[PDB]
Every structure is written in structure tokens, then in C-alpha cells.
């Protein structure tokens, strides 16, 4: 303690923003960060008393959010569910709800199942002014809102960088190569 | 049969333990040359007769297993021992010792194995005069028999 | 092979059983190849004997 | 076996199963490939022997 006090003269503090960044920077619905000083201690702690700290603003979960222009970051980590974007033909002017839950059983369009699972991400309603076969994101982590930012490849690379993901991929490859070796040694 | 193969292997080991002599050494050198040229380095698919090709392929498989594979295994064991000693020294996994000692051991045990089953491999060449390989093997066997003053088959 | 071939793995998952054993499956496949080598060698030897 | 015996007990990573109803559709047909393969192999071997 006391000696620690001495070491307090030179000890330095470091911010904790690491690998996540300022969410308020990326999510428009996320309010800017605030620092709240707790109120002074209450003199009498009563059983029926309530907390007196200042209240944070109430931000209800939006049912759907507008398609951020390529600057959309995931609210909560969604299901992977696929490593290949889907080339869907959309008619012009038709408001389609790109699913964000990742558990939507109705393909690229939102299935409304998002309202039944514990997650922060809500479907994004988008409208294409020109009809055509557009590549809708299936990685669920594309910076472009409805469009696949080819970040499926980045997610696949990150998974392959992980030890467990590398082990799984190499095991699948090894089983395929074992079948291949059996075929090669079949005629012998 | 399997008993015949076991007896042949044991007799070969016993003979290699007993000695290699001088006339026997020269005959072994000649037989090794013949096996290397007409069998080991000659693709069995090139032979005219299909039966000759089959017999040469059987002999080649025997050489690949009894000589090449055994020598590779002995060299790999020597390489594993050397690499274990080296990793013990440096307290880390090296890369050169594995391949280097594997190649050295393959080169070393390659002749010794060829020294043991020299006769046995020759025994796989007696196709008969109906094949060109058979005629050449008969000539080589006649030369070896003249050298050794003994009638082989 | 696995969830990759399907476009909505969650759906695919449920569409089989509504249960998840994926990591078990991957580790099992690796170990299965690594073990399946030896029985293959033994069966090759036995088949050669039968052909003889 | 290992996963159930190491991370499924009450004192080791229990799971709260919120499963009102099952919704499987192709599970039986998908898993039936293994029985089908065995049946085909048995039938082929018998037809060859018989």
C-alpha cells in the first residue's frame, strides 16, 4: 500500500480501446460516449430507497435501420451461415429487408425471426433504384449494407488464421487426400 | 509361401553374418550390376513379353520393398537419432539433420541391403530362355557359376 | 463439406436435426483419416494373400 | 463422448436449452445414406455369391 503509493508517482494509465474501437464512431444509432460522475454518497441506506445516479438515455431497439452507405458495422456478432454471397435478382423500387440476425430461415430477405433471439442487430430495409442481379452479402459482415464487400474472403482468411479453424480445414483436406491416396493405391 | 519367405530371410541374415568371401563378393557385385541395369533401373513395362513384364515388375516390387524401403527405414532411424541428439544440443528443432542424415543413411544401407538379398533378387530373374531377359539372366548365371565352380539354378 | 456447401447454415443445421456437433465432426474427421491409414495397410496385405 | 463428459456436466459448461419444438425436415433422409450404403453393399455381396 504505502510503498505502492510511492510507485503511484510514476505509474501511468492506458486507454482500453483495443480491437473494438469507438462504436459510437461507426453506428449512427449508437449515441456518442459519455462520462457520468456518480452522485455524492447517500447518508442513509434504506431498504425502500432507489439509486440516484443520472439515468442514461433510453434507446429502444429499432425494428429496422436504414442501409448505411457502406459504413455499417455489426451491432452484435451475427451467425456466419455462409461463405459465398448470393446473386439475387431484385426488381427496382421494391423495399427488401436484408436479414441481419443470421438465423433468418427465409434467405437474403428478413424472416422476422430476429425478434425472437438475443441479439442487437436488426434487419436493414433497402430499395434498389435499378433492377438487376445484385450480389447480396451472405457473410453478414460486409461493410456495404446490402452489397457483399467481398469481406467473406477476409472472414475466411481470418478463420484460416485461427488455430482451431486451421485444424478443421486441414482435417477436411486430409480426409480428402486420404481418399485420394486410397484411390492412387487402389490398383496395386 | 510365407514359411519359405521366412526361411529365405533368416538364411540370408545368417549368411551375411557368416561372411561374404571373395569369389562370392565378386559374384554379388556382378549380380548387383545385373539387377541394377536390367531390373532396378530398367522400367519393367518396356519388356516385350507381357509375362516377362509381370515377372520383372514382381522383382522390382521386391527390390523396392526389401532393399529401397528397408534402406530408407534404416536411414530414417539413424536420422531420427541424430536429429534427437542435435535438438538436445540446441534445445530447438533443426531442419537440416533430418534430410541430410536420411540421405546419408539411404546411401549407406542401400548397398548393405543389396549385399544381403543379392542371390534372392537373382532368383526372381529365372524366367527362362523364352524371354530375352531370361536369356541374359542365364548368361549371367553361367558366368557366375563358372566363377564360383558351383552349379546354381 | 459441412456448413460451407449450404448458403444458410443455420437453416441447414435445423433442417437436419436442430443440433450442433460441428467441432466434434471436424476433429473426428482428422483423427479418422489418421487412424484409417493402418486398417487400409492390413487389408491390402490380406487381399494380396487372398489373390495369391 | 469426450465433449459430453468434459463440457456438458452441471459443474462444467451447462447449457440452457430453449427448444420449444423441433423443426427438422431432411435429417432422416440425410442420415439414411449410411444405412443405404450398408444395404447396397450387403445386397451386392449376396448377389455376387448367390
Amino acid at each position: 500500500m504505502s510503498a505502492i503509493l510511492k510507485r503511484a508517482a510514476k505509474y501511468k494509465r492506458v486507454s482500453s480501446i483495443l480491437c473494438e474501437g469507438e462504436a459510437h464512431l461507426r453506428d449512427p444509432f449508437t449515441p456518442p460516449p459519455v462520462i457520468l460522475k456518480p452522485p455524492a454518497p447517500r447518508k442513509d441506506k434504506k431498504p425502500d430507497d432507489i439509486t440516484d445516479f443520472p439515468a442514461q438515455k433510453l434507446i429502444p431497439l429499432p425494428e429496422s435501420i436504414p442501409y448505411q452507405e457502406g459504413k455499417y458495422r455489426p451491432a452484435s456478432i451475427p451467425m456466419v451461415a455462409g461463405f459465398f454471397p448470393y446473386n439475387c435478382y431484385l426488381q427496382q423500387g421494391k423495399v427488401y429487408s436484408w436479414c441481419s440476425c443470421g438465423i433468418s430461415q427465409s434467405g437474403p430477405w428478413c424472416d422476422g425471426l430476429c425478434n425472437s433471439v438475443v441479439t442487437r442487430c436488426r434487419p436493414v430495409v433497402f430499395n434498389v433504384s435499378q433492377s438487376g442481379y445484385y450480389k447480396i452479402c451472405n457473410c453478414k459482415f460486409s461493410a456495404n449494407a446490402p452489397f457483399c464487400n467481398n469481406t467473406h474472403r477476409k472472414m475466411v482468411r481470418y478463420h484460416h488464421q485461427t488455430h482451431r479453424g486451421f485444424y478443421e480445414i486441414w482435417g477436411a483436406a486430409l480426409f480428402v487426400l486420404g481418399w485420394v491416396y486410397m484411390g492412387f493405391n487402389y490398383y496395386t | 509361401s510365407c514359411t519359405t519367405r521366412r526361411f529365405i530371410d533368416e538364411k540370408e541374415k545368417l549368411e551375411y553374418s557368416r561372411g561374404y568371401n571373395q569369389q562370392e563378393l565378386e559374384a554379388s557385385k556382378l549380380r548387383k550390376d545385373f539387377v541394377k541395369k536390367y531390373i532396378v533401373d530398367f522400367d519393367t513395362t518396356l519388356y516385350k513379353t507381357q509375362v516377362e513384364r509381370d515377372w520383372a515388375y514382381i522383382a522390382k516390387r521386391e527390390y523396392r520393398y526389401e532393399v529401397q524401403l528397408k534402406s530408407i527405414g534404416y536411414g530414417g532411424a539413424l536420422a531420427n537419432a541424430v536429429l534427437l541428439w542435435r535438438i538436445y544440443a540446441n534445445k530447438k528443432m533443426v531442419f537440416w539433420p533430418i534430410p541430410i542424415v536420411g540421405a546419408l543413411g539411404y546411401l549407406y544401407f542401400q548397398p548393405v541391403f543389396f549385399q544381403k538379398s543379392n542371390k534372392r533378387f537373382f532368383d526372381m530373374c529365372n524366367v527362362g530362355e523364352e524371354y530375352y531377359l531370361g536369356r541374359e539372366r542365364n548368361k549371367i548365371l553361367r558366368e557366375c557359376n563358372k566363377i564360383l565352380n558351383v552349379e546354381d539354378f | 463439406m459441412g456448413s460451407v456447401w449450404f448458403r444458410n447454415r443455420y437453416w441447414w443445421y435445423r433442417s437436419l436435426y436442430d443440433d450442433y456437433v460441428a467441432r466434434e465432426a471436424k476433429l473426428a474427421f482428422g483423427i479418422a483419416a489418421f487412424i484409417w491409414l493402418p486398417h487400409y495397410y492390413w487389408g491390402i496385405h490380406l487381399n494380396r494373400a487372398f489373390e495369391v | 463422448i469426450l465433449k459430453v463428459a468434459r463440457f456438458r456436466v452441471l459443474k462444467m459448461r451447462p447449457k440452457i436449452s430453449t427448444s420449444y419444438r423441433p423443426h427438422g425436415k431432411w435429417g432422416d433422409f440425410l442420415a439414411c445414406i449410411i444405412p443405404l450404403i450398408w444395404c447396397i453393399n450387403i445386397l451386392t455381396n449376396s448377389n455376387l455369391i448367390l
Binding site: 486410397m182 484411390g183 496395386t188 | 509381370d54 516390387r61 | 487400409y40 491390402i44 494380396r48 | 447396397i40 453393399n41
Partner: peptide, 21 residues
Amino acid sequence: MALFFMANTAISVPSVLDTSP
């Protein structure tokens, strides 16, 4: 059996060479 049931075809097995005089 199957297309690949024994998983190994011993093509090396050659016809037994007759050795009658």
C-alpha cells in the same frame, strides 16, 4: 461389394508360371 469395396486391387499378382520340364 461396391465400386470401391476391397479398396485394393492386387494387379501385381501375376499368373503362376508353369515349370514342367
